[PDB]
Amino acid sequence: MSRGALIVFEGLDKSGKTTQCMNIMESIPANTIKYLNFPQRSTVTGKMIDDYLTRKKTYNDHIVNLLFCANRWEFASFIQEQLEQGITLIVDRYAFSGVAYAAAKGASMTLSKSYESGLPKPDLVIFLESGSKEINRNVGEEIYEDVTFQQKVLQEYKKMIEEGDIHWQIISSEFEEDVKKELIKNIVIEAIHTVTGPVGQLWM
Amino acid sequence: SRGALIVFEGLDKSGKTTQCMNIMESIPANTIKYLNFPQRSTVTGKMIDDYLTRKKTYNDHIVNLLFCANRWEFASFIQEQLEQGITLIVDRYAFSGVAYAAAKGASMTLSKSYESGLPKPDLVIFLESGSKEINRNVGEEIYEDVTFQQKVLQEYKKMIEEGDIHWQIISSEFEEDVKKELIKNIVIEAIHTVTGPVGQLWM
Numbered sequence: 001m002s003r004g005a006l007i008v009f010e011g012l013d014k015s016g017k018t019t020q021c022m023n024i025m026e027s028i029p030a031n032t033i034k035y036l037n038f039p040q041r042s043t044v045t046g047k048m049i050d051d052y053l054t055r056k057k058t059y060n061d062h063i064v065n066l067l068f069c070a071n072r073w074e075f076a077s078f079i080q081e082q083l084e085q086g087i088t089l090i091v092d093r094y095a096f097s098g099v100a101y102a103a104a105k106g107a108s109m110t111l112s113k114s115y116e117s118g119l120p121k122p123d124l125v126i127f128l129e130s131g132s133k134e135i136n137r138n139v140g141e142e143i144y145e146d147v148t149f150q151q152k153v154l155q156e157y158k159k160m161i162e163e164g165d166i167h168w169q170i171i172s173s174e175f176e177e178d179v180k181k182e183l184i185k186n187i188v189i190e191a192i193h194t195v196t197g198p199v200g201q202l203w204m
Numbered sequence: 205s206r207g208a209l210i211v212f213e214g215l216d217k218s219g220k221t222t223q224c225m226n227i228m229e230s231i232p233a234n235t236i237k238y239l240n241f242p243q244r245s246t247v248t249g250k251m252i253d254d255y256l257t258r259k260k261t262y263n264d265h266i267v268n269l270l271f272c273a274n275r276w277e278f279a280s281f282i283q284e285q286l287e288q289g290i291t292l293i294v295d296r297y298a299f300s301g302v303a304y305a306a307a308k309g310a311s312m313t314l315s316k317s318y319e320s321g322l323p324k325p326d327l328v329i330f331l332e333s334g335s336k337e338i339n340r341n342v343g344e345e346i347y348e349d350v351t352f353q354q355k356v357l358q359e360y361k362k363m364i365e366e367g368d369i370h371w372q373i374i375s376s377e378f379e380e381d382v383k384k385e386l387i388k389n390i391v392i393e394a395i396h397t398v399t400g401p402v403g404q405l406w407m
């Protein structure tokens with residue numbers, strides 16, 4: 001009824017989403033909103049994923065895919081609990097990143113979704129488009145920062161946004177940083193003030 | 205001589221845990237450790253327990269994945285113990301994962317690709333189940349269903365066939381003392397013939 005809102009930020013690498021989360025966190029009542037990032041590096045799967053992303057260890061595509069997904073499931077209760085307590089979660093990447101990136105590497109879009117099926121359903125999923133100055137920002141320091149791979153990931157994101165069962169909001173890359181900041185700031189506080197009812201389930 | 209990775213498999217109520225403890229008592233507690241899957245001390249381990257005892261539900265795909273990730277959380281632990289000379293007695297492993305996922309309808313090939321890369325066991329002891337064991341599956345936990353167990357056994361056999369890993373089936377016709385002694389022996393024998401590096405399962 002007056003639960004917190006579950007707001008997710010999605011986007012390619014270098015889309016500036018991490019920066020947009022900081023902004024929102026700073027422009028909202030401290031003791032009523034938390035930040036949550038995936039992969040969540042404070043767990044064992046989280047550290048294995050950190051080892052894979054930082055080149056210091058390899059795993060088959062399938063295994064990383066499930067590690068990322070299990071990583072999220074470890075927090076399915078944490079998320080649901082916070083929301084029921086009135087705490088709003090600003091989530092950096094969620095099941096959508098998982099599906100987009102897995103499918104970009106070759107996995108089935110639909111099989112991937114069933115692995116995220118049941119996770120707390122976001123109320124809003126803000127996608128930060130990245131222009132060609134941001135797309136070519138991927139020098140390649142982490143394992144997923146190539147150029148045609150980022151374009152294949154972009155395609156998967158599009159398929160999902162075009163399904164329509166999830167309330168997405170795309171913020172054009174063409175806004176000025178100060179405008180982007182105010183745009184997001186207003187839609188987010190709006191979601192916090194009006195969010196009601198129980199926490200739904202994703203893709204079920 | 206590194207540690208031997210010895211895995212125990214079998215249907216529900218087959219006496220796995222019992223035999224695994226029998227080994228833990230008859231062998232020098234120092235060079236041997238017990239590892240139980242699902243390892244219920246982790247966050248995924250507890251979600252698995254809640255699923256098994258019907259406290260929570262998840263799609264089949266999610267349960268398959270939790271079990272799998274649950275083993276991967278310990279993939280490094282395992283490999284580090286083997287090389288430090290410690291032998292691992294493991295209650296259920298990758299084989300349980302594929303056998304139970306497939307009985308539910310998953311592709312065995314796909315299931316195996318998720319276990320692909322874990323430390324390869326040096327010996328897998330399969331505890332065959334008799335009528336008494338089979339009948340002990342009365343629905344207490346979510347998979348203890350006689351007819352479901354039968355299809356899990358089909359998956360187990362399918363894997364036994366592939367001449368990949370080293371399997372040993374222990375007859376359900378042996379009595380407790382001879383059974384305990386037999387396993388104690390193939391296990392002791394296994395610990396002392398281990399050579400080469402730790403392999404990779406279905407790589």
Ligand SMILES: Cc1cn([C@H]2C[C@H](O)[C@@H](COP(=O)(O)OP(=O)(O)O)O2)c(=O)[nH]c1=O
Binds near residue numbers: 014098099101142144
């Ligand atoms: C959450 C998630 C992230 N990823 C990738 C996105 C990034 O390439 C990498 C790190 O994500 P993240 O921690 O958000 O860092 P960044 O600022 O680069 O986005 O993990 C997946 O492949 N699958 C997933 O499920």
Ligand SMILES: Cc1cn([C@H]2C[C@H](O)[C@@H](COP(=O)(O)OP(=O)(O)O)O2)c(=O)[nH]c1=O
Binds near residue numbers: 221297347
């Ligand atoms: C390891 C594993 C176990 N299981 C099931 C086997 C059992 O039905 C259940 C509990 O196993 P376990 O904790 O070993 O107890 P027991 O073998 O006596 O039943 O977990 C899977 O379905 N997949 C797996 O990957």
Ligand SMILES: [Mg+2]
Binds near residue numbers: 216217345348
């Ligand atoms: Mg059981």
